[PDB]
Coordinates of C-alpha atoms and ligand atoms in Angstrom, one line a residue:
Chain A
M1404 CA 177.9 79.2 -24.2
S1405 CA 180.2 82.4 -23.7
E1406 CA 183.0 83.0 -26.3
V1407 CA 185.4 82.0 -23.6
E1408 CA 183.2 78.7 -22.9
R1409 CA 183.3 78.0 -26.6
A1410 CA 187.0 78.5 -26.9
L1411 CA 187.7 76.3 -23.7
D1412 CA 185.4 73.5 -25.5
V1413 CA 187.5 73.8 -28.8
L1414 CA 190.8 73.3 -26.8
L1415 CA 189.3 70.1 -25.0
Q1416 CA 187.6 68.6 -28.2
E1417 CA 190.9 69.0 -30.1
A1418 CA 193.1 67.7 -27.2
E1419 CA 190.6 64.9 -26.9
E1420 CA 190.6 64.0 -30.6
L1421 CA 194.3 64.2 -30.8
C1422 CA 194.8 62.1 -27.4
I1423 CA 197.1 65.0 -25.9
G1424 CA 198.5 63.6 -22.5
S1425 CA 196.2 61.0 -22.4
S1426 CA 198.1 58.4 -20.9
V1427 CA 201.3 57.5 -19.2
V1428 CA 203.7 56.1 -21.6
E1429 CA 205.2 52.7 -20.1
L1430 CA 208.9 51.6 -21.0
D1431 CA 210.9 48.6 -19.9
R1432 CA 214.2 50.0 -21.2
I1433 CA 215.8 53.5 -20.6
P1434 CA 215.3 55.6 -23.9
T1435 CA 218.1 57.3 -25.8
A1436 CA 218.4 60.9 -24.9
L1437 CA 217.0 61.8 -28.4
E1438 CA 214.0 59.5 -27.8
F1439 CA 213.5 61.1 -24.4
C1440 CA 213.7 64.6 -26.0
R1441 CA 211.5 64.2 -28.8
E1442 CA 208.6 62.0 -27.5
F1443 CA 208.5 63.0 -23.7
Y1444 CA 210.3 66.3 -22.9
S1445 CA 209.1 68.3 -26.2
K1446 CA 205.6 66.8 -26.0
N1447 CA 205.4 67.9 -22.4
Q1448 CA 204.5 63.8 -22.0
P1449 CA 204.8 61.7 -19.0
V1450 CA 206.5 58.4 -19.1
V1451 CA 207.0 55.7 -16.5
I1452 CA 210.3 53.1 -17.1
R1453 CA 210.1 50.1 -15.2
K1454 CA 213.1 48.7 -13.4
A1455 CA 215.2 51.2 -14.9
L1456 CA 217.7 51.8 -11.9
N1457 CA 219.6 49.4 -9.9
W1458 CA 221.1 51.9 -7.4
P1459 CA 222.7 50.3 -4.1
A1460 CA 220.1 52.5 -2.4
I1461 CA 217.4 50.2 -3.9
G1462 CA 217.5 47.1 -1.6
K1463 CA 219.7 48.5 1.1
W1464 CA 217.9 51.8 2.2
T1465 CA 215.7 50.7 5.2
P1466 CA 214.9 52.9 8.3
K1467 CA 217.5 50.8 10.2
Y1468 CA 220.2 51.5 7.5
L1469 CA 219.3 55.0 7.4
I1470 CA 219.7 55.4 11.2
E1471 CA 222.9 53.8 11.3
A1472 CA 224.4 55.4 8.1
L1473 CA 223.2 59.0 9.3
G1474 CA 224.0 58.5 13.0
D1475 CA 220.6 59.1 14.1
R1476 CA 220.6 62.6 12.9
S1477 CA 218.1 65.1 13.6
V1478 CA 216.0 65.5 10.7
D1479 CA 213.3 68.2 9.4
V1480 CA 209.7 66.3 9.6
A1481 CA 206.1 67.6 8.7
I1482 CA 203.4 66.5 11.0
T1483 CA 199.7 66.8 10.5
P1484 CA 196.7 65.4 12.3
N1485 CA 194.9 64.4 9.1
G1486 CA 197.6 63.3 6.6
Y1487 CA 197.5 66.3 4.5
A1488 CA 200.7 68.4 4.7
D1489 CA 200.1 71.3 2.2
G1490 CA 196.2 70.4 1.7
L1491 CA 192.7 71.5 3.0
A1492 CA 190.9 71.2 6.0
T1493 CA 188.2 72.7 7.9
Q1494 CA 187.9 74.3 11.4
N1495 CA 185.1 76.4 12.8
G1496 CA 183.1 76.5 9.8
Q1497 CA 186.1 77.8 7.6
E1498 CA 188.1 75.7 4.8
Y1499 CA 191.8 76.6 5.1
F1500 CA 194.9 75.6 2.9
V1501 CA 197.0 74.2 5.8
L1502 CA 200.7 74.2 5.8
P1503 CA 202.3 71.2 8.2
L1504 CA 203.8 71.5 11.6
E1505 CA 207.3 71.4 11.0
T1506 CA 209.9 70.2 13.6
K1507 CA 213.0 68.5 14.2
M1508 CA 213.7 65.1 15.3
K1509 CA 215.9 62.2 15.3
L1510 CA 215.3 59.5 12.8
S1511 CA 214.7 56.7 15.3
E1512 CA 212.1 58.9 16.8
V1513 CA 210.4 59.3 13.4
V1514 CA 210.5 55.7 12.7
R1515 CA 208.7 55.3 16.2
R1516 CA 206.0 57.7 15.3
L1517 CA 205.7 56.1 12.0
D1518 CA 204.9 52.7 13.7
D1519 CA 201.9 54.2 15.4
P1520 CA 198.7 54.1 13.2
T1521 CA 196.7 56.1 15.5
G1522 CA 199.3 59.0 16.2
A1523 CA 199.9 62.3 14.5
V1524 CA 200.8 61.4 10.6
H1525 CA 204.7 62.1 10.0
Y1526 CA 206.3 62.7 6.8
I1527 CA 209.9 63.7 5.8
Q1528 CA 208.9 65.7 2.7
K1529 CA 210.8 69.1 3.2
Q1530 CA 212.2 68.9 -0.4
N1531 CA 214.0 72.1 -1.0
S1532 CA 216.9 69.9 -2.0
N1533 CA 216.8 68.4 1.4
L1534 CA 219.1 65.3 0.3
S1535 CA 222.1 67.5 -1.1
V1536 CA 221.7 69.9 1.8
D1537 CA 220.6 67.8 4.8
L1538 CA 221.6 64.1 3.8
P1539 CA 224.4 64.4 1.7
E1540 CA 226.0 60.9 2.6
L1541 CA 223.1 59.3 0.8
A1542 CA 224.4 60.4 -2.5
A1543 CA 227.0 57.8 -2.4
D1544 CA 224.2 55.2 -2.9
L1545 CA 223.1 56.9 -6.1
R1546 CA 224.1 57.3 -9.6
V1547 CA 222.7 60.5 -11.0
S1548 CA 224.6 60.0 -14.3
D1549 CA 222.0 57.1 -14.9
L1550 CA 219.5 60.1 -15.4
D1551 CA 221.6 61.5 -18.3
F1552 CA 218.9 60.5 -20.8
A1553 CA 216.5 62.9 -19.3
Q1554 CA 219.1 65.5 -18.1
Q1555 CA 220.5 66.2 -21.7
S1556 CA 216.8 67.6 -22.2
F1557 CA 217.0 69.9 -19.2
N1558 CA 220.6 70.9 -20.0
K1559 CA 221.6 71.5 -16.4
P1560 CA 222.3 70.0 -13.2
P1561 CA 219.3 69.3 -10.8
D1562 CA 218.2 72.7 -9.2
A1563 CA 216.8 70.5 -6.4
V1564 CA 217.4 66.7 -5.0
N1565 CA 214.9 65.7 -2.5
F1566 CA 214.4 62.7 -0.1
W1567 CA 211.0 61.6 0.9
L1568 CA 210.2 59.1 3.5
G1569 CA 206.4 58.9 4.7
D1570 CA 203.4 57.6 6.7
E1571 CA 200.9 55.5 4.1
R1572 CA 198.3 58.3 5.8
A1573 CA 200.5 61.1 4.4
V1574 CA 198.9 62.3 1.2
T1575 CA 200.3 64.9 -1.2
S1576 CA 197.2 66.8 -2.5
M1577 CA 197.0 67.7 -6.0
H1578 CA 199.1 70.6 -7.2
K1579 CA 201.8 71.5 -10.1
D1580 CA 205.2 72.5 -9.9
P1581 CA 207.3 74.8 -12.3
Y1582 CA 209.9 72.0 -12.5
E1583 CA 210.8 68.9 -14.8
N1584 CA 210.7 66.2 -12.3
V1585 CA 212.6 62.6 -12.4
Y1586 CA 211.0 60.7 -9.7
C1587 CA 212.8 57.7 -8.5
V1588 CA 211.2 55.4 -5.9
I1589 CA 213.7 53.5 -3.7
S1590 CA 211.5 51.4 -1.5
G1591 CA 207.7 50.4 -1.7
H1592 CA 205.6 52.6 -4.0
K1593 CA 204.0 55.7 -5.1
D1594 CA 200.4 56.2 -6.4
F1595 CA 200.3 59.2 -8.9
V1596 CA 197.2 60.9 -10.1
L1597 CA 198.1 63.1 -12.9
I1598 CA 196.2 65.7 -15.1
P1599 CA 197.6 67.6 -18.1
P1600 CA 198.1 71.1 -18.0
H1601 CA 195.5 71.9 -21.0
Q1602 CA 192.8 70.4 -18.8
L1603 CA 192.9 73.4 -16.2
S1604 CA 189.4 74.5 -17.1
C1605 CA 188.1 70.9 -15.7
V1606 CA 190.2 71.3 -12.4
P1607 CA 188.3 73.4 -9.7
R1608 CA 190.6 76.0 -7.8
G1609 CA 189.6 78.0 -4.9
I1610 CA 191.2 80.8 -2.9
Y1611 CA 191.7 79.7 0.8
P1612 CA 192.8 81.4 3.8
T1613 CA 196.0 80.0 4.6
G1614 CA 196.8 78.3 8.1
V1615 CA 199.5 76.4 9.8
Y1616 CA 199.1 73.4 12.2
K1617 CA 200.0 73.9 15.7
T1618 CA 199.7 72.1 18.9
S1619 CA 197.8 73.1 22.0
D1620 CA 198.8 72.6 25.7
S1621 CA 196.9 69.3 25.7
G1622 CA 198.9 68.1 22.7
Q1623 CA 195.6 68.7 20.2
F1624 CA 196.2 69.8 16.9
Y1625 CA 194.6 73.2 15.6
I1626 CA 194.7 75.4 12.7
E1627 CA 196.6 78.8 13.2
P1628 CA 195.4 81.2 10.5
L1629 CA 198.0 83.3 8.8
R1630 CA 197.2 86.9 8.8
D1631 CA 199.2 89.9 7.3
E1632 CA 200.2 93.1 9.6
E1633 CA 196.7 94.7 8.2
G1634 CA 195.0 91.7 9.9
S1635 CA 194.0 90.2 6.5
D1636 CA 194.0 86.6 5.8
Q1637 CA 197.0 85.5 3.6
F1638 CA 195.1 83.6 0.8
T1639 CA 196.4 80.5 -1.3
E1640 CA 194.8 79.2 -4.4
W1641 CA 194.7 75.6 -4.3
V1642 CA 193.0 72.7 -6.2
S1643 CA 189.7 72.0 -4.6
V1644 CA 188.8 68.6 -5.9
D1645 CA 189.7 65.3 -4.2
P1646 CA 191.0 63.1 -7.0
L1647 CA 190.5 60.0 -4.9
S1648 CA 186.7 60.4 -4.5
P1649 CA 185.5 63.6 -6.6
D1650 CA 182.4 65.1 -5.7
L1651 CA 180.9 65.7 -9.4
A1652 CA 177.8 67.0 -8.2
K1653 CA 179.7 70.2 -6.7
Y1654 CA 182.5 70.2 -9.5
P1655 CA 180.7 69.1 -12.7
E1656 CA 183.6 70.7 -14.8
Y1657 CA 185.7 67.8 -13.3
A1658 CA 183.9 65.2 -15.2
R1659 CA 185.5 66.2 -18.2
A1660 CA 188.9 65.7 -16.9
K1661 CA 190.9 62.5 -17.7
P1662 CA 193.0 61.8 -14.7
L1663 CA 195.9 59.3 -15.1
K1664 CA 196.6 56.6 -12.5
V1665 CA 200.3 55.3 -12.2
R1666 CA 201.9 53.2 -9.5
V1667 CA 205.9 53.8 -9.3
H1668 CA 207.7 50.8 -7.7
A1669 CA 211.5 50.5 -6.4
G1670 CA 213.9 51.2 -9.3
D1671 CA 211.0 52.7 -11.7
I1672 CA 211.5 56.0 -12.9
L1673 CA 208.4 58.4 -13.6
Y1674 CA 209.0 61.6 -15.7
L1675 CA 206.5 64.1 -14.4
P1676 CA 206.6 67.0 -16.8
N1677 CA 206.5 70.5 -15.7
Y1678 CA 203.1 72.0 -14.8
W1679 CA 201.2 68.7 -15.0
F1680 CA 198.7 68.5 -12.0
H1681 CA 199.8 65.6 -9.6
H1682 CA 198.1 64.0 -6.3
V1683 CA 200.6 61.6 -4.5
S1684 CA 200.0 58.6 -2.2
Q1685 CA 202.5 56.2 -0.8
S1686 CA 202.9 52.6 0.9
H1687 CA 203.9 52.8 4.4
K1688 CA 207.3 54.1 5.1
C1689 CA 207.8 54.3 1.3
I1690 CA 211.4 56.1 0.5
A1691 CA 211.8 58.0 -2.7
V1692 CA 214.2 60.5 -4.3
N1693 CA 213.4 63.1 -7.0
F1694 CA 215.1 65.6 -9.1
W1695 CA 213.5 69.0 -10.0
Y1696 CA 215.0 70.9 -13.0
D1697 CA 213.8 74.6 -13.8
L1698 CA 211.5 74.7 -16.7
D1699 CA 212.5 76.1 -20.0
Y1700 CA 209.8 78.8 -20.9
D1701 CA 208.0 78.6 -24.3
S1702 CA 204.5 79.5 -25.5
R1703 CA 202.9 76.8 -23.6
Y1704 CA 203.3 78.7 -20.3
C1705 CA 201.8 81.9 -21.7
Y1706 CA 199.0 79.8 -23.0
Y1707 CA 198.7 78.3 -19.5
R1708 CA 198.5 81.9 -17.9
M1709 CA 195.8 82.5 -20.5
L1710 CA 193.9 79.5 -19.4
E1711 CA 193.8 80.7 -15.8
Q1712 CA 192.8 84.2 -16.8
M1713 CA 189.9 82.5 -18.6
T1714 CA 188.8 80.4 -15.8
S1715 CA 189.2 83.1 -13.2
Chain B
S384 CA 186.5 98.3 -21.5
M385 CA 187.9 94.8 -22.7
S386 CA 186.1 91.7 -23.3
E387 CA 186.6 88.5 -21.4
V388 CA 188.2 87.4 -24.5
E389 CA 190.2 90.4 -25.0
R390 CA 191.3 90.1 -21.4
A391 CA 192.4 86.4 -22.3
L392 CA 194.2 87.6 -25.2
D393 CA 196.0 90.5 -23.3
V394 CA 197.2 88.2 -20.6
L395 CA 198.6 85.9 -23.3
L396 CA 200.4 88.6 -25.1
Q397 CA 201.8 90.3 -21.7
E398 CA 203.2 87.0 -20.5
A399 CA 204.7 86.2 -23.8
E400 CA 206.3 89.8 -23.9
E401 CA 207.8 89.8 -20.7
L402 CA 209.5 86.4 -21.6
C403 CA 210.2 87.5 -25.0
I404 CA 209.0 84.2 -26.4
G405 CA 210.0 84.2 -30.1
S406 CA 211.7 87.4 -30.0
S407 CA 214.6 86.8 -31.9
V408 CA 215.9 84.2 -34.5
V409 CA 218.7 82.3 -33.1
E410 CA 222.3 82.8 -34.9
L411 CA 224.3 79.6 -35.0
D412 CA 227.7 79.2 -37.0
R413 CA 227.6 75.2 -37.1
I414 CA 225.0 72.6 -37.6
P415 CA 223.8 71.3 -34.2
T416 CA 223.5 67.8 -33.1
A417 CA 220.0 66.2 -33.6
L418 CA 219.5 66.3 -29.6
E419 CA 220.6 69.9 -29.8
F420 CA 218.1 70.8 -32.4
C421 CA 215.2 69.0 -30.8
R422 CA 216.0 70.6 -27.5
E423 CA 216.6 74.4 -28.5
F424 CA 214.4 74.5 -31.5
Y425 CA 211.8 71.8 -32.3
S426 CA 210.6 71.6 -28.9
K427 CA 210.5 75.3 -28.4
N428 CA 208.8 76.1 -31.9
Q429 CA 211.8 78.4 -32.1
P430 CA 213.4 79.5 -35.7
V431 CA 217.0 79.5 -36.1
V432 CA 219.3 80.4 -38.8
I433 CA 222.7 78.5 -39.4
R434 CA 225.2 80.5 -41.2
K435 CA 227.4 78.9 -44.0
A436 CA 226.0 75.6 -43.1
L437 CA 225.8 74.1 -46.5
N438 CA 228.5 73.3 -49.3
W439 CA 226.3 71.5 -51.6
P440 CA 227.7 71.4 -55.1
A441 CA 224.5 73.3 -55.9
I442 CA 225.7 76.4 -54.2
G443 CA 228.6 76.7 -56.7
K444 CA 227.1 75.5 -60.0
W445 CA 223.2 76.4 -60.3
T446 CA 223.4 79.2 -62.5
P447 CA 220.7 79.9 -65.2
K448 CA 223.0 78.6 -67.7
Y449 CA 223.9 75.3 -65.8
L450 CA 220.2 74.8 -64.9
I451 CA 219.2 75.2 -68.6
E452 CA 221.9 72.7 -69.8
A453 CA 221.1 70.2 -67.0
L454 CA 217.4 70.2 -67.7
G455 CA 217.5 70.1 -71.4
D456 CA 215.9 73.3 -71.3
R457 CA 212.9 71.6 -69.8
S458 CA 209.5 73.4 -70.1
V459 CA 208.7 74.2 -66.5
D460 CA 205.6 75.6 -64.4
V461 CA 206.1 79.2 -63.7
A462 CA 203.9 81.8 -62.1
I463 CA 203.2 85.3 -63.4
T464 CA 201.7 88.3 -61.8
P465 CA 201.8 91.9 -62.8
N466 CA 202.2 93.4 -59.3
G467 CA 204.7 90.8 -58.1
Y468 CA 202.1 89.2 -55.4
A469 CA 201.3 85.6 -56.4
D470 CA 198.6 84.4 -53.6
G471 CA 198.2 88.0 -52.4
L472 CA 195.9 90.7 -52.2
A473 CA 195.0 93.2 -55.1
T474 CA 192.1 95.5 -56.0
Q475 CA 190.1 95.6 -59.2
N476 CA 187.1 97.8 -59.9
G477 CA 186.8 98.9 -56.4
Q478 CA 186.9 95.4 -55.0
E479 CA 189.8 93.6 -53.0
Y480 CA 190.4 89.9 -53.8
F481 CA 193.0 87.3 -53.0
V482 CA 194.7 86.5 -56.1
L483 CA 196.3 83.4 -57.5
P484 CA 199.1 83.6 -59.8
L485 CA 198.6 83.1 -63.7
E486 CA 200.2 79.7 -64.3
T487 CA 201.7 78.5 -67.4
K488 CA 204.5 76.4 -68.8
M489 CA 207.5 77.6 -70.6
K490 CA 211.1 76.7 -71.2
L491 CA 213.7 77.6 -68.7
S492 CA 215.6 79.7 -71.1
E493 CA 212.4 81.8 -71.7
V494 CA 211.7 82.3 -67.9
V495 CA 215.3 83.7 -67.5
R496 CA 214.7 85.8 -70.5
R497 CA 211.8 87.3 -68.8
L498 CA 213.4 87.7 -65.4
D499 CA 215.8 89.8 -67.3
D500 CA 213.1 92.4 -68.3
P501 CA 212.9 94.9 -65.5
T502 CA 209.7 96.4 -66.7
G503 CA 207.9 93.2 -67.8
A504 CA 205.4 91.0 -65.9
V505 CA 207.0 89.2 -62.5
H506 CA 207.9 85.6 -63.0
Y507 CA 208.5 82.9 -60.2
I508 CA 209.1 79.4 -60.4
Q509 CA 207.0 78.8 -57.1
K510 CA 205.0 75.7 -57.6
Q511 CA 206.0 74.2 -54.3
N512 CA 204.2 71.0 -53.9
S513 CA 207.4 68.9 -53.9
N514 CA 208.2 70.5 -57.6
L515 CA 211.9 69.7 -57.1
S516 CA 211.5 65.7 -56.3
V517 CA 208.5 65.6 -58.8
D518 CA 209.3 67.8 -61.8
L519 CA 213.1 68.3 -61.6
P520 CA 214.7 65.1 -60.1
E521 CA 218.1 65.4 -61.9
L522 CA 218.8 68.4 -59.5
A523 CA 218.8 66.3 -56.6
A524 CA 222.3 65.2 -57.5
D525 CA 223.6 68.5 -56.5
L526 CA 222.2 68.1 -53.1
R527 CA 223.2 66.5 -49.8
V528 CA 219.9 66.0 -47.9
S529 CA 221.8 63.9 -45.3
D530 CA 223.1 67.2 -44.0
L531 CA 219.6 68.0 -42.5
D532 CA 219.4 65.0 -40.6
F533 CA 219.9 67.0 -37.5
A534 CA 216.5 68.3 -38.1
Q535 CA 214.9 65.3 -39.7
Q536 CA 215.8 63.3 -36.7
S537 CA 213.7 65.6 -34.6
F538 CA 210.7 65.5 -37.0
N539 CA 211.3 61.7 -37.2
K540 CA 209.8 61.2 -40.9
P541 CA 211.2 61.8 -44.1
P542 CA 210.3 65.1 -46.0
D543 CA 206.9 65.6 -47.3
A544 CA 207.9 67.9 -50.0
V545 CA 211.1 69.4 -51.5
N546 CA 210.6 72.6 -53.3
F547 CA 212.7 74.7 -55.8
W548 CA 212.2 78.3 -55.9
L549 CA 213.8 80.7 -58.5
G550 CA 212.3 84.3 -58.5
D551 CA 212.3 88.0 -59.7
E552 CA 213.5 90.5 -56.9
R553 CA 209.9 91.8 -57.5
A554 CA 208.3 88.6 -56.5
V555 CA 207.1 88.8 -53.0
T556 CA 205.2 86.0 -51.1
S557 CA 202.6 87.7 -48.7
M558 CA 202.4 86.7 -45.1
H559 CA 200.8 83.3 -44.5
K560 CA 201.5 80.4 -42.2
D561 CA 202.1 76.6 -43.0
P562 CA 201.2 73.2 -41.1
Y563 CA 204.7 72.2 -41.8
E564 CA 208.0 72.2 -40.2
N565 CA 210.1 73.9 -42.9
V566 CA 213.9 73.8 -43.4
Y567 CA 214.9 76.4 -46.0
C568 CA 218.3 76.3 -47.8
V569 CA 219.1 79.3 -49.9
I570 CA 221.3 78.2 -53.1
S571 CA 221.9 81.4 -54.9
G572 CA 221.3 85.1 -53.3
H573 CA 219.4 85.6 -50.3
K574 CA 215.9 85.6 -48.8
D575 CA 214.4 88.3 -46.5
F576 CA 212.0 86.6 -44.1
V577 CA 209.5 88.7 -41.9
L578 CA 208.2 86.2 -39.3
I579 CA 205.6 86.4 -36.6
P580 CA 204.8 83.6 -33.9
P581 CA 201.8 82.0 -33.8
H582 CA 200.9 83.0 -30.3
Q583 CA 200.6 86.7 -31.6
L584 CA 197.8 85.8 -33.9
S585 CA 195.4 88.4 -32.3
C586 CA 197.8 91.0 -33.4
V587 CA 197.9 89.9 -37.2
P588 CA 194.7 91.1 -39.0
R589 CA 193.0 88.5 -41.1
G590 CA 190.0 89.1 -43.6
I591 CA 187.8 87.3 -46.0
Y592 CA 188.3 88.0 -49.4
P593 CA 186.8 86.9 -52.8
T594 CA 189.1 84.7 -54.7
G595 CA 190.3 85.5 -58.1
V596 CA 193.1 84.4 -60.6
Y597 CA 195.2 86.5 -62.8
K598 CA 194.8 86.3 -66.6
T599 CA 196.0 88.1 -69.6
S600 CA 193.5 89.7 -72.3
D601 CA 194.1 89.5 -76.4
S602 CA 196.1 92.5 -75.9
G603 CA 198.4 91.3 -73.2
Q604 CA 197.0 93.3 -70.3
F605 CA 196.6 91.6 -67.1
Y606 CA 193.1 91.4 -64.9
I607 CA 191.7 89.6 -62.1
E608 CA 189.0 86.9 -62.6
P609 CA 186.8 85.8 -60.1
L610 CA 186.9 82.1 -59.1
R611 CA 183.6 80.3 -58.9
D612 CA 182.9 76.8 -57.7
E613 CA 181.7 74.7 -60.7
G614 CA 178.1 77.9 -58.4
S615 CA 179.1 80.9 -56.0
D616 CA 182.0 83.1 -55.7
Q617 CA 184.7 81.7 -53.8
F618 CA 186.3 83.1 -50.8
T619 CA 189.6 82.8 -48.6
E620 CA 190.9 84.0 -45.4
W621 CA 194.1 85.8 -45.7
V622 CA 196.3 88.1 -43.6
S623 CA 195.3 91.6 -44.2
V624 CA 198.6 93.6 -43.4
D625 CA 201.5 94.7 -45.4
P626 CA 204.3 93.9 -43.2
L627 CA 206.7 96.2 -45.2
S628 CA 204.5 99.3 -44.7
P629 CA 201.7 98.4 -42.2
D630 CA 198.8 100.5 -41.8
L631 CA 198.6 101.0 -38.2
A632 CA 195.6 103.5 -38.2
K633 CA 193.7 100.7 -40.3
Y634 CA 195.2 97.8 -38.0
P635 CA 196.1 99.3 -34.5
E636 CA 196.3 95.6 -33.1
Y637 CA 199.2 95.1 -35.4
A638 CA 201.2 97.7 -33.4
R639 CA 201.4 95.2 -30.6
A640 CA 203.0 92.5 -33.2
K641 CA 206.8 91.9 -32.7
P642 CA 208.0 91.0 -36.3
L643 CA 211.6 89.4 -36.8
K644 CA 213.4 90.1 -39.9
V645 CA 216.0 87.6 -41.0
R646 CA 218.3 87.6 -44.2
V647 CA 219.1 84.1 -45.5
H648 CA 222.3 83.9 -47.7
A649 CA 223.5 81.2 -50.1
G650 CA 224.7 78.2 -47.8
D651 CA 222.5 79.3 -45.0
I652 CA 219.8 77.2 -43.4
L653 CA 216.6 78.8 -41.7
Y654 CA 214.2 76.6 -39.7
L655 CA 211.0 77.9 -39.9
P656 CA 208.7 76.2 -37.3
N657 CA 205.3 75.3 -38.0
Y658 CA 202.5 77.7 -38.0
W659 CA 204.8 80.7 -37.7
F660 CA 203.5 83.4 -40.3
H661 CA 206.1 84.3 -42.9
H662 CA 206.3 87.1 -45.5
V663 CA 209.2 86.2 -48.0
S664 CA 211.3 88.6 -50.5
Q665 CA 214.3 87.7 -52.5
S666 CA 217.2 89.1 -54.2
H667 CA 216.9 88.8 -58.1
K668 CA 216.9 85.4 -59.5
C669 CA 217.4 84.0 -56.0
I670 CA 217.4 80.2 -56.1
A671 CA 216.4 78.2 -52.9
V672 CA 215.4 74.7 -52.1
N673 CA 213.1 74.0 -48.9
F674 CA 211.9 70.8 -47.2
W675 CA 208.5 70.4 -45.7
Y676 CA 207.7 67.9 -42.9
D677 CA 204.2 67.3 -42.0
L678 CA 203.8 68.6 -38.2
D679 CA 203.2 66.4 -35.1
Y680 CA 200.2 67.5 -33.4
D681 CA 200.8 68.5 -29.7
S682 CA 199.4 70.8 -27.2
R683 CA 200.6 73.9 -29.1
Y684 CA 198.3 73.2 -32.0
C685 CA 195.4 72.6 -29.5
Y686 CA 196.1 76.0 -27.8
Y687 CA 196.3 77.6 -31.5
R688 CA 193.0 76.0 -32.3
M689 CA 191.4 77.8 -29.5
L690 CA 193.2 81.2 -30.2
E691 CA 191.5 80.9 -33.9
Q692 CA 188.4 80.5 -32.2
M693 CA 189.1 83.6 -29.8
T694 CA 190.1 85.6 -32.9
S695 CA 187.0 85.4 -35.3
Ligands
LIG1000 O1 206.1 62.6 -3.1 C1 205.0 63.2 -2.7 O2 204.6 62.9 -1.8 C2 204.9 64.5 -3.4 N1 206.2 64.8 -4.5 C3 205.9 65.8 -5.3 O3 204.8 66.7 -5.2 C4 207.0 66.1 -6.3 O4 207.8 65.2 -6.4 O5 206.7 67.0 -7.0
LIG1001 O1 210.2 81.4 -50.7 C1 209.1 82.0 -50.8 O2 208.7 83.1 -51.8 C2 207.9 81.4 -50.0 N1 208.3 80.1 -49.3 C3 207.4 79.7 -48.4 O3 206.2 80.5 -48.1 C4 207.9 78.5 -47.5 O4 208.9 78.1 -47.8 O5 206.7 77.8 -46.9
LIG1002 MN1 205.0 68.3 -6.6
LIG1003 MN1 205.1 79.2 -46.6

């Protein structure tokens, strides 16, 4: 082994022996603020809390209710042919990281498209705090103070509050965010696959030309490459593995990853700590809200940047 | 120019330098809540000094005379060196050794007598190993350890050691690190710490030195005796640099270190987080007590083990 390979081996053997990030802790009761800070926030350690929330949104938010309550408002929706907004797709021999087609439409039309299992895949996943900016009325059916047990660790209000409503075919491919994430399913369920950041060396990442989905004259989807004004492809680094069906022959390093699986039901809270890898699937027409808080930087981020350099 | 390992260490250090990780000892004027301590200091591996935090009876009462009277002029373990560097590097006959102190037992009144001799050998009650709870139990009555609950609730375990320190100004503790969270309480005088964060390991030169112990001859003159396993000469890894006057020509990598200086007065508390390098000096006949808690292994330990592998 190289000296870098020897060092990465040491990291992984130590983390394995000490069970770092080796499970998703399951709680049936909301912990105290101190508990959360000590056992989950400070260890960068995920946790799922079952039936933690009894917000009126839970049990009342349906497509019909939302159409009524919002007056069939026009909302931002992402559309893909293949179900992978912000995900890899191939065209004419080339693999692209592809951004969704984004458009505006009335909620009733979104619901109609969600009821077509062979049509294009629709997903209200704009995030960018779309709930507080675009759907503020929904806030009245939530109680954010119920998240104080976690927010005390972040010691600031959410930097974003997001609303998600999607087709079962809409899959969020694996990525990491520079946020603490408190994830609250409202209706249906979400299936998460999670990988700890210290396993970066087991997760293959490529550099892909970036494209965006567009529709042709005939309504057919294609990928429009993004180029800069110099004619160069705009590149995006992206996780290359499919956690649902990994090709261990192409990516043997992934064999050493220990992906964690967790289903999150209505009323459950998942704490997804900063820089954790996650891939997300959903039940059909699943509804969820989530709260992003900017991370607080310490040495772990610098070690992560070192890990990136070592695997480059 | 640079190896792969050296490029990776450079990225680590550049990211830590831009974020100023561990760039200052935090100054508080009052004891934080447990949640605050866990969020701002424990979880960040971040040193903090709390000014005039403690009013323990000891701070008023512990003089040499009171200590003699209270311990019945007990015979105590005391460490003696000629140069003031117990557990520190010294040269003899052209060879550089890491030297352990001459350890002996003598009555406290005699120790104090020898502290008052500015030209005599350097004495230091530095046994650690929880010498206060073990060898000087009565002194506990002048303490209020409950006042440290703000920190202990974050370590969520009782102290693993309680140590008592009383030293000559000449007695200096050379730079080292400990696998313990350290809550350090100055009772009389002041301590001067030089602190270096663990992610700067590659900036701190470390060597392998033959191990020796101080002894005195029939004539009273000090010398170093090599230590041998009951076998070969024994060796120890030790920090090579003198942070008070570093030889940057011999150790240019130390120029990239960013040491912190903090003075801890009577009544003050210093949180010295696990694995931080520290060098410690004291006012004359300084008295201190500290508490060690075994560390909880997290990802930072795994990263640090990897860093040790890369720095060898
Ligand atoms: O809900 C999804 O499909 C994906 N969500 C996220 O990546 C997130 O909350 O960070
Ligand atoms: O006080 C001293 O001289 C040295 N103390 C320590 O190294 C410590 O408390 O861990
Ligand atoms: Mn995400
Ligand atoms: Mn120490």
